Amino acid sequence: AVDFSAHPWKAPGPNDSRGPCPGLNTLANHGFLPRNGRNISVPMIVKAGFEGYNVQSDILILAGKVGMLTSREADTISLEDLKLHGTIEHDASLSREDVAIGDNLHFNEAIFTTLANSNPGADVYNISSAAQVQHDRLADSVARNPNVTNTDLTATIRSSESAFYLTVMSAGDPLRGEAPKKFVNVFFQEERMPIKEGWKRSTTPINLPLLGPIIDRITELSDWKPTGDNCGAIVLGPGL
Amino acid sequence: AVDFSAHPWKAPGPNDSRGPCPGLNTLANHGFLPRNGRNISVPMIVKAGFEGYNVQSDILILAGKVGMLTSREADTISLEDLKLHGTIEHDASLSREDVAIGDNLHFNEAIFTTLANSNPGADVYNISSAAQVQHDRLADSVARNPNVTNTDLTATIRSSESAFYLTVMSAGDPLRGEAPKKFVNVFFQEERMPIKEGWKRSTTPINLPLLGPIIDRITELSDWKPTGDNCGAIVLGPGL
Ligand code: HEM
Ligand code: HEM
Ligand SMILES: *[C@@H]1O[C@H](CO)[C@@H](O)[C@H](O)[C@H]1NC(C)=O
Ligand SMILES: *[C@@H]1O[C@H](CO)[C@@H](O)[C@H](O)[C@H]1NC(C)=O
Ligand SMILES: *[C@@H]1O[C@H](CO)[C@@H](O)[C@H](O)[C@H]1NC(C)=O
Ligand SMILES: *[C@@H]1O[C@H](CO)[C@@H](O)[C@H](O)[C@H]1NC(C)=O
Ligand SMILES: *[C@@H]1O[C@H](CO)[C@@H](O)[C@H](O)[C@H]1NC(C)=O
Ligand SMILES: *[C@@H]1O[C@H](CO)[C@@H](O)[C@H](O)[C@H]1NC(C)=O
Ligand SMILES: CCCCCCCCCCCCCC
Ligand SMILES: CCCCCCCCCCCCCC
Ligand SMILES: [Mg+2]
Ligand SMILES: [Mg+2]
């Protein structure tokens, strides 16, 4: 049985590995993944994402094995390894800076302002607000980053990530594609499960069939267009 | 200290998974990897390649983790999974057909004829013969396959594979970049270590520093040019 009371939030120490992903960082901060953020396998991620968020193995195996490429080890990563630019890590993040013009690893409040201020007049973020934020964040990178990369692949990953915050931090059925701002804000700003605030793990499995139409709708509403190269080539390992 | 008498060749049975790679197939056929070809992890590949061939973890971790993408499992593959087109598997193979116009999985004697007939008048294959074979195999694909994919990435993989047969099946120092035809022919045709024929595991470690200049020289001598977009994008998982 999973006992959330047995999984308290603790702030990471200075030598606990944390990465650019709030999903995995939050799992580590609650001990669903190792609190040190090290020696993490795809099986560990699969189990952690299921226990913490009811996210299913389909998306976690797919994403997990791509993430494994970022380390030099046979079958594990440190969470910090995931910052490797151009494997999964991309420009026009929701809460991090572009690597060419800043820190692509740590939560940045100034970047996060765009998301925080989205969906004015409501107490939830939803698909249309998520799309607007993606549009605005990409425009910011195009304006300010002379090395900006924007491809079909980065755009899809970005929509996947928005679909994650909308589903995993939902109050009701994750199908609805909306999440309380108070929950999503805690998730990004503190990398904590907002238990005190009333959040509970989804009782509905979050899998590719559920996420797919949400992802596609976020993309559609974001008014995304190709801007240049558009080759969806990933970096296959570190130090190439 | 490896005892190859403890690792006899046995023909694969009808339920044994085999893939497009003679290196891994041969390891399975000698029980360095599971003879059934199933539930193979990157650690297993690292250990197997070391024990069988003296191939080091640098190349096997890098290649292994890319290979893991081809399955639906968290941290293992079946050898047959590696046939997934556009992850590692490519057009203009040495011993398989292009997927668009034939069987990209099984050894094909007619394809192998080009390699078998290379370096006429010597009893070895070497860097210049390997380069000629790559040139000729690519020309064949460009002639006969309207869907040919030929990129910096596929060209590098192809030269890596040639460097592998030249080094792993060598008689003396793998550094020399030459291997007896009688050894290489058995390797491809029977997916067997040619022990009876006089082959022994290299006493020199085969790693990226050793392979790199061989790879680069094969490419240089092959009179290579890209096709089309030259997009080095890999397929990130099955059933996309
Ligand atoms: C399934 C539960 C997970 C959730 C809820 C989740 C959530 C998120 C969110 C919301 C972001 C966007 C952060 C931003 O734009 O500032 C993100 C980024 C990221 N995630 Fe995850 N994630 C999960 C699993 C994974 C897995 C399994 C990996 C393994 C590769 C991963 C790797 C990353 C990376 C590398 C980024 C940085 C992308 C970027 O913004 O540049 N995530 N994740
Ligand atoms: C252990 C030492 C290795 C050797 C000596 C070796 C040798 C070879 C050779 C010679 C080929 C070319 C076959 C051809 O063109 O017909 C090949 C193809 C291939 N190898 Fe390996 N290999 C090794 C390790 C690996 C590993 C670790 C992976 C992935 C886990 C891998 C995946 C492949 C794939 C997918 C192909 C097919 C590429 C193609 O021809 O389309 N190999 N290998
Ligand atoms: C990582 O985890 C594996 C599996 O539990 C263990 O055998 C190994 O000793 C660990 N390595 C480190 C760095 O602690
Ligand atoms: C998101 O919320 C806003 C404000 O409540 C609303 O106007 C908009 O239609 C919503 N979008 C979706 C897709 O539910
Ligand atoms: C980034 O862009 C600048 C300005 O065009 C250029 O000088 C530099 O070489 C680029 N760097 C990369 C990472 O390609
Ligand atoms: C082993 O491989 C089979 C398919 O051949 C798969 O169903 C099974 O889950 C695998 N198990 C693991 C996790 O190694
Ligand atoms: C090959 O290319 C043609 C033309 O671009 C395309 O219609 C077809 O679907 C492709 N695939 C195969 C394997 O024939
Ligand atoms: C390969 O062998 C042939 C025939 O012996 C020889 O002409 C050629 O120079 C050799 N090339 C290399 C790279 O040693
Ligand atoms: C954090 C999300 C990572 C997801 C990686 C792969 C999913 C994206 C779309 C599917 C693969 C890309 C080719 C269509
Ligand atoms: C199976 C052999 C190679 C497949 C993956 C190679 C990874 C990308 C190549 C870049 C560096 C390796 C050789 C120079
Ligand atoms: Mg980023
Ligand atoms: Mg092939």
Side-chain angles (χ1 to χ4, degrees):
Chain A
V2 174
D3 182 351
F4 276 73
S5 289
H7 287 274
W9 186 84
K10 303 189 183 149
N15 288 279
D16 287 335
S17 192
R18 291 292 181 274
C21 175
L24 296 181
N25 288 343
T26 297
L27 291 171
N29 287 338
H30 285 266
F32 287 106
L33 289 173
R35 294 180 181 278
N36 69 3
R38 290 157 200 286
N39 210 26
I40 295 174
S41 68
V42 177
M44 285 162 72
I45 293 167
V46 165
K47 176 164 228 195
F50 178 78
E51 290 189 1
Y53 301 143
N54 208 355
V55 170
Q56 301 307 299
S57 68
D58 58 357
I59 182 70
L60 296 177
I61 284 167
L62 173 63
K65 287 189 302 185
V66 173
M68 293 293 116
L69 300 173
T70 66
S71 80
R72 288 189 173 77
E73 285 75 56
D75 67 351
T76 56
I77 66 178
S78 300
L79 292 180
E80 187 173 340
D81 289 339
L82 292 174
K83 74 191 180 179
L84 179 60
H85 183 67
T87 304
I88 295 168
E89 196 281 322
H90 55 73
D91 300 328
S93 290
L94 300 164
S95 74
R96 274 56 172 175
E97 307 173 320
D98 294 4
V99 72
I101 61 169
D103 173 343
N104 75 338
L105 172 57
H106 301 110
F107 177 80
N108 184 281
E109 180 53 41
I111 295 285
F112 184 70
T113 290
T114 306
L115 197 163
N117 292 341
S118 70
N119 220 23
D123 67 357
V124 295
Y125 305 121
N126 65 17
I127 285 173
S128 53
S129 73
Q132 189 62 55
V133 171
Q134 287 181 197
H135 176 96
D136 291 357
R137 291 293 308 109
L138 177 55
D140 180 63
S141 287
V142 166
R144 297 199 303 116
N145 179 0
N147 305 120
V148 60
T149 298
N150 171 52
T151 65
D152 283 321
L153 177 61
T154 64
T156 302
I157 291 173
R158 289 166 63 244
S159 290
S160 300
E161 289 160 357
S162 296
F164 265 147
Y165 80 70
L166 289 175
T167 53
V168 166
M169 285 295 113
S170 65
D173 203 314
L175 279 173
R176 285 174 56 111
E178 68 168 46
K181 298 191 181 170
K182 73 196 165 186
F183 295 173
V184 171
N185 292 346
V186 165
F187 176 68
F188 276 96
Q189 291 173 325
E190 303 178 345
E191 294 176 335
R192 179 169 65 77
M193 294 168 170
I195 291 163
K196 155 165 65 74
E197 292 82 4
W199 171 88
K200 306 180 181 275
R201 172 184 182 277
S202 171
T203 62
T204 302
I206 298 164
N207 57 11
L208 286 172
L210 186 149
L211 291 168
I214 295 173
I215 290 166
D216 288 348
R217 198 62 176 127
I218 294 170
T219 290
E220 183 169 32
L221 289 177
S222 75
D223 176 44
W224 183 87
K225 298 175 181 296
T227 47
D229 180 61
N230 214 7
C231 181
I234 62 162
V235 170
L236 296 179
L240 295 175
Chain B
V2 172
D3 196 19
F4 278 72
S5 73
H7 287 98
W9 187 84
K10 303 188 174 177
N15 310 143
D16 287 343
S17 193
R18 292 291 181 276
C21 174
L24 299 182
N25 289 344
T26 298
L27 290 171
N29 286 340
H30 286 264
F32 286 107
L33 291 173
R35 294 180 181 279
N36 67 5
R38 297 177 184 284
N39 297 114
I40 297 179
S41 67
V42 176
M44 286 162 71
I45 292 164
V46 166
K47 179 172 221 168
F50 178 78
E51 291 191 1
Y53 301 144
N54 208 355
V55 169
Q56 300 308 299
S57 65
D58 56 357
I59 183 71
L60 295 175
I61 287 173
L62 175 57
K65 287 191 297 191
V66 175
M68 295 292 116
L69 299 175
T70 65
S71 79
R72 290 196 164 75
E73 285 75 56
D75 67 351
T76 58
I77 64 176
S78 303
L79 290 182
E80 187 173 339
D81 290 338
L82 293 173
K83 74 191 180 177
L84 178 60
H85 184 66
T87 303
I88 298 174
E89 194 284 321
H90 54 74
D91 299 330
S93 292
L94 300 166
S95 72
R96 272 58 173 176
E97 306 174 320
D98 295 4
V99 73
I101 61 176
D103 173 344
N104 76 336
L105 172 58
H106 300 110
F107 176 82
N108 183 282
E109 180 53 41
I111 295 287
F112 184 68
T113 291
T114 307
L115 198 163
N117 289 344
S118 69
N119 220 23
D123 67 356
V124 294
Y125 303 121
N126 67 16
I127 285 174
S128 55
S129 73
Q132 189 63 55
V133 171
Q134 288 182 196
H135 176 94
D136 292 355
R137 291 295 306 109
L138 178 57
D140 180 61
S141 287
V142 164
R144 296 196 304 115
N145 181 2
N147 298 84
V148 60
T149 302
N150 165 57
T151 65
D152 283 325
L153 176 62
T154 64
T156 302
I157 293 173
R158 286 168 66 241
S159 290
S160 301
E161 288 160 356
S162 294
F164 265 146
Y165 79 70
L166 290 176
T167 53
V168 168
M169 285 297 111
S170 64
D173 206 313
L175 274 170
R176 283 181 51 109
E178 68 163 45
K181 299 191 181 170
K182 70 202 157 163
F183 294 174
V184 170
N185 290 345
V186 164
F187 176 68
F188 276 94
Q189 289 174 320
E190 298 176 355
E191 292 178 335
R192 178 168 63 78
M193 294 168 176
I195 293 167
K196 162 166 64 71
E197 293 79 5
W199 172 88
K200 308 190 179 274
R201 172 184 182 276
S202 171
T203 63
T204 301
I206 299 165
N207 57 11
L208 286 173
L210 185 151
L211 290 169
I214 296 173
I215 292 167
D216 289 346
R217 195 67 179 123
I218 293 172
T219 293
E220 190 177 24
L221 289 175
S222 75
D223 182 40
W224 180 83
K225 290 161 37 66
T227 302
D229 291 342
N230 195 13
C231 182
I234 62 158
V235 168
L236 297 177
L240 299 172

